[PDB]
Amino acid sequence: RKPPKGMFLSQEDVEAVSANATAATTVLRQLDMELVSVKRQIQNIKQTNSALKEKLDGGIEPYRLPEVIQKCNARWTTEEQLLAVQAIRKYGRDFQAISDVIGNKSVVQVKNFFVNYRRRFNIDEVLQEWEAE
Amino acid sequence: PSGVEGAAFQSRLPHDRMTSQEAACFPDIISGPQQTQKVFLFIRNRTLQLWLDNPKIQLTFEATLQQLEAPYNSDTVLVHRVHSYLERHGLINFGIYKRIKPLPTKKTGKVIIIGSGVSGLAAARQLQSFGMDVTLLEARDRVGGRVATFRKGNYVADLGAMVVTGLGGNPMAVVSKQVNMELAKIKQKCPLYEANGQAVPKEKDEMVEQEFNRLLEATSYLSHQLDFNVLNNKPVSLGQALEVVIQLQEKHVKDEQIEHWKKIVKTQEELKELLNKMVNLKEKIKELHQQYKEASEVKPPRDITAEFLVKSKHRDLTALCKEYDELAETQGKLEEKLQELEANPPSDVYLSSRDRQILDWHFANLEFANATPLSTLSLKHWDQDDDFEFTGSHLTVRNGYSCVPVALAEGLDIKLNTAVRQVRYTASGCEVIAVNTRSTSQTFIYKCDAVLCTLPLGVLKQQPPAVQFVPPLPEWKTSAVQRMGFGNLNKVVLCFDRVFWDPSVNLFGHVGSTTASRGELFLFWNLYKAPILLALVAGEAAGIMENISDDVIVGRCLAILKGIFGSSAVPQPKETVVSRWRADPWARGSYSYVAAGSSGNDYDLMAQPITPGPSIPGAPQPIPRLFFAGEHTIRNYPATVHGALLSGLREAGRIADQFLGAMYTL
Numbered sequence: 001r002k003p004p005k006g007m008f009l010s011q012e013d014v015e016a017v018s019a020n021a022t023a024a025t026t027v028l029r030q031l032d033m034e035l036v037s038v039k040r041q042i043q044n045i046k047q048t049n050s051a052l053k054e055k056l057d058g059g060i061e062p063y064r065l066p067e068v069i070q071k072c073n074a075r076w077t078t079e080e081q082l083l084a085v086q087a088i089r090k091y092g093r094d095f096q097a098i099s100d101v102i103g104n105k106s107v108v109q110v111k112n113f114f115v116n117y118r119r120r121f122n123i124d125e126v127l128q129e130w131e132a133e
Numbered sequence: 134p135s136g137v138e139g140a141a142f143q144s145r146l147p148h149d150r151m152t153s154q155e156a157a158c159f160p161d162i163i164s165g166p167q168q169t170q171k172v173f174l175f176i177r178n179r180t181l182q183l184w185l186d187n188p189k190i191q192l193t194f195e196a197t198l199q200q201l202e203a204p205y206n207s208d209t210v211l212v213h214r215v216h217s218y219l220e221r222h223g224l225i226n227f228g229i230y231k232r233i234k235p236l237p238t239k240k241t242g243k244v245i246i247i248g249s250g251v252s253g254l255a256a257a258r259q260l261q262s263f264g265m266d267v268t269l270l271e272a273r274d275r276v277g278g279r280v281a282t283f284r285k286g287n288y289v290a291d292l293g294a295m296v297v298t299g300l301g302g303n304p305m306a307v308v309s310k311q312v313n314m315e316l317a318k319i320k321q322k323c324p325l326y327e328a329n330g331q332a333v334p335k336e337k338d339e340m341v342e343q344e345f346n347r348l349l350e351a352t353s354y355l356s357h358q359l360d361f362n363v364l365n366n367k368p369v370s371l372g373q374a375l376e377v378v379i380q381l382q383e384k385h386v387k388d389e390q391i392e393h394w395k396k397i398v399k400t401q402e403e404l405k406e407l408l409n410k411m412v413n414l415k416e417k418i419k420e421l422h423q424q425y426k427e428a429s430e431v432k433p434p435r436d437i438t439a440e441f442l443v444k445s446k447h448r449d450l451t452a453l454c455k456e457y458d459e460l461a462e463t464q465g466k467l468e469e470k471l472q473e474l475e476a477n478p479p480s481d482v483y484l485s486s487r488d489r490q491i492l493d494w495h496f497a498n499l500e501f502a503n504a505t506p507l508s509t510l511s512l513k514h515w516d517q518d519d520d521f522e523f524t525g526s527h528l529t530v531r532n533g534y535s536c537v538p539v540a541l542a543e544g545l546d547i548k549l550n551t552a553v554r555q556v557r558y559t560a561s562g563c564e565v566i567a568v569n570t571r572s573t574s575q576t577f578i579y580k581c582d583a584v585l586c587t588l589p590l591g592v593l594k595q596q597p598p599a600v601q602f603v604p605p606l607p608e609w610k611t612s613a614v615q616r617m618g619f620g621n622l623n624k625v626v627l628c629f630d631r632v633f634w635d636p637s638v639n640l641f642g643h644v645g646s647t648t649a650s651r652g653e654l655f656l657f658w659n660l661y662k663a664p665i666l667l668a669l670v671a672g673e674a675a676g677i678m679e680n681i682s683d684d685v686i687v688g689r690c691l692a693i694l695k696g697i698f699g700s701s702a703v704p705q706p707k708e709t710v711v712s713r714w715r716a717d718p719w720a721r722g723s724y725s726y727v728a729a730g731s732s733g734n735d736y737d738l739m740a741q742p743i744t745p746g747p748s749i750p751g752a753p754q755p756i757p758r759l760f761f762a763g764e765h766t767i768r769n770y771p772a773t774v775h776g777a778l779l780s781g782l783r784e785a786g787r788i789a790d791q792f793l794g795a796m797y798t799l
């Protein structure tokens with residue numbers, strides 16, 4: 001009920017080979033054409049690829065810059081809230097993109113910077129012009 | 134298989150079962166209780182055993198009964214019925230034996246047998262054994278028919294039947310004990326030597342052989358489970374199926390290639406959008422970089438908007454480059470995944486070139502086994518007789534296979550050189566017309582109660598007919614002969630001064646250079662004690678080789694087997710002979726095969742004897758007057774000598790049962 005080895009025989013193809021006398025040759029030949037077809041598609045895409053692979057030479061290494069090493073500080077001097085409200089003016093609710101620009105405040109002390117110095121800094125009023133655009 | 138049951142196997146009968154024939158002969162037993170048919174079975178294959186342990190003498194009914202024992206020897210009328218059943222159909226007391234009880238003084242009834250082929254010799258020999266007078270009519274100047282040995286000096290090589298196929302369940306296992314038959318053994322290993330003349334490596338041999346075999350069972354799949362049978366309202370032959378499974382396999386190899394390269398590209402352009410997004414990520418890493426550093430070259434002190442700008446743009450480089458790096462590693466996990474997808478290419482071709490002329494060699498000797506091109510063989514039925522093939526291994530006959538028929542012809546009147554041109558049968562009797570084949574004007578008229586026709590199926594297909602039947606044979610027979618196949622295969626026997634070949638190998642092959650010539654002298658045979666080599670021409674080559682000269686055929690021989698063993702390493706043969714069987718008027722071919730559109734049933738149809746019409750309209754319908762034996766008759770043992778003599782035996786039994794009556798049906 002099964003082919004003896006890794007040979008494949010089942011109805012749907014045998015009628016395609018028996019449809020006429022040349023069905024065999026016409027069924028393998030356009031398969032050969034569809035083979036060399038995509039093959040030239042390959043070598044084409046390879047050759048386009050190597051071009052911009054050349055465009056990526058050197059990596060970004062000249063544009064990398066040393067990472068800042070710091071320890072998180074408990075309190076605030078006056079500058080990093082002036083930094084903070086500007087950062088949320090450009091950014092809003094993305095906090096690890098604020099915690100980084102301040103840099104001496106890790107992630108979670110930026111969010112309790114959203115409910116205390118507030119109507120003083122008028123934060124929900126600066127939050128919706130990051131929402132307008 | 135031993136015991137009283139080993140006789141049942143060796144005699145081609147079941148042990149625990151009861152055949153349809155003995156059912157017809159012993160209906161009381163088969164319809165009766167289980168126990169009585171059990172004891173009958175025992176009695177049957179027991180007397181079988183006694184005949185099989187000493188085939189060299191007749192065993193009488195008084196020879197068996199005393200060697201049975203209770204409660205089996207209790208019922209004598211039954212053991213008489215079984216013994217008188219078996220000798221009648223030739224299961225016991227057949228072939229060549231010395232009969233203790235001299236024959237009847239006067240014969241009863243008359244039959245003439247057409248042709249001295251082994252089937253005719255068996256029929257006539259046992260009909261004489263039954264107390265009938267028989268005469269045999271041969272067109273040839275010799276007996277044996279399609280068993281023909283060439284004998285010159287010490288050089289014997291058979292151009293006809295050569296090997297016995299197994300001794301297990303072979304009727305000729307007993308005749309090999311009856312006549313002096315030294316049965317040697319062929320050796321299965323065949324080296325294949327290419328057209329260059331040097332052998333094919335072993336790995337290629339194994340590869341192509343298992344591939345071949347698996348194409349065969351592929352065809353079997355096509356017939357049985359897919360019912361791929363008719364095409365264009367015409368039956369399919371295993372040649373056509375072989376080429377369609379070959380085509381399907383090549384097709385697959387292609388579409389798995391395409392399935393492979395499709396996914397190498399479809400992971401490859403999935404690298405495109407990514408490193409395009411890398412180039413137009415990088416350029417803005419640059420733009421934003423000089424933005425940041427031009428911001429940081431504003432020198433302190435600063436108002437918090439400028440410090441904001443430098444530290445914000447600093448984060449904008451320090452979250453941008455990370456989305457360069459992580460997808461330099463996402464890139465980095467794509468682009469090195471194309472060289473192992475390259476490193477596992479599917480096979481370039483399903484099958485290559487030179488190996489096709491090897492697998493063509495296998496196809497060739499398949500066309501040899503069946504004596505016909507694979508284009509002609511019925512796909513469904515060509516192997517139908519494979520279930521009945523014997524056990525043990527194939528044995529050659531070194532002193533020649535003609536020793537058995539000449540042994541049978543002892544004691545019978547064979548009239549040689551008389552060719553039957555007309556067979557004439559009606560309700561009152563039969564008369565056949567013969568012609569002396571040397572002086573063709575001399576005509577002979579024989580009259581008898583029945584005729585048995587051993588004529589090879591080729592001569593029955595002959596048109597315009599070589600043997601006329603009056604009245605003509607009925608349509609159901611003539612069309613069965615028309616649709617039956619008759620093949621052709623031929624042998625070239627070459628006789629040298631001594632052996633330049635390997636004595637260890639009994640047979641060695643040579644691959645042809647094209648599909649068309651694949652049957653042309655593809656294998657050679659060293660089976661004989663003299664410096665005899667013989668090469669086989671088969672397939673569609675055999676039909677073309679007959680009408681060309683002998684010296685060019687031996688020329689192609691010596692040409693082939695020079696490059697095999699070296700140019701000077703061969704002599705040129707003392708004398709050679711080639712067979713042409715299809716050109717033989719008393720053969721018109723080699724042996725039969727089931728053709729596309731034919732089946733095993735046709736064999737059955739060709740066994741059925743022919744009754745004439747009533748002589749006077751209004752008369753009781755007459756007795757069957759015309760019977761048929763030969764290899765083309767026995768269904769599940771066709772195209773063999775054992776099948777032939779089996780047919781002859783059974784219709785000796787049928788002739789006898791009709792004109793001598795059956796006293797074993799009480």
Ligand SMILES: Cc1cc2nc3c(=O)[nH]c(=O)nc-3n(C[C@H](O)[C@H](O)[C@H](O)COP(=O)(O)OP(=O)(O)OC[C@H]3O[C@@H](n4cnc5c(N)ncnc54)[C@H](O)[C@@H]3O)c2cc1C
Pocket residue numbers: 247248249250251252253270271272273276277278279280292293294295296297298551552553554587588589592599600622623624714718719720722723724762763764765771772773774775777
């Ligand atoms: C090359 C070859 C190799 C073979 N090898 C084997 C083998 O290895 N093993 C095996 O088992 N079988 C083999 N066979 C087949 C086997 O030889 C036959 O099946 C068997 O011998 C045929 O016996 P037969 O009596 O049925 O036919 P035949 O032997 O042909 O008997 C028919 C007889 O009738 C005679 N006759 C024909 N026309 C007329 C006429 N018009 N008037 C009067 N008489 C006529 C013929 O001369 C012939 O003698 C081989 C056959 C061939 C051709």
Ligand SMILES: CCOCc1cccc(NC(=O)c2cc3sccc3n2C)c1COc1ccc(OC[C@@H]2CCNC2)cc1
Pocket residue numbers: 295296298319321501502503518527640724725771772773
């Ligand atoms: C088992 C492989 O042995 C190879 C070999 C070596 C030497 C001689 C022969 N074999 C022979 O020389 C040989 C044996 C027999 S029986 C009828 C023909 C014939 N031939 C040519 C063989 C192959 O044996 C067979 C060949 C053909 C065959 O045909 C199957 C029957 C016959 C027609 N209908 C199905 C059966 C066995």
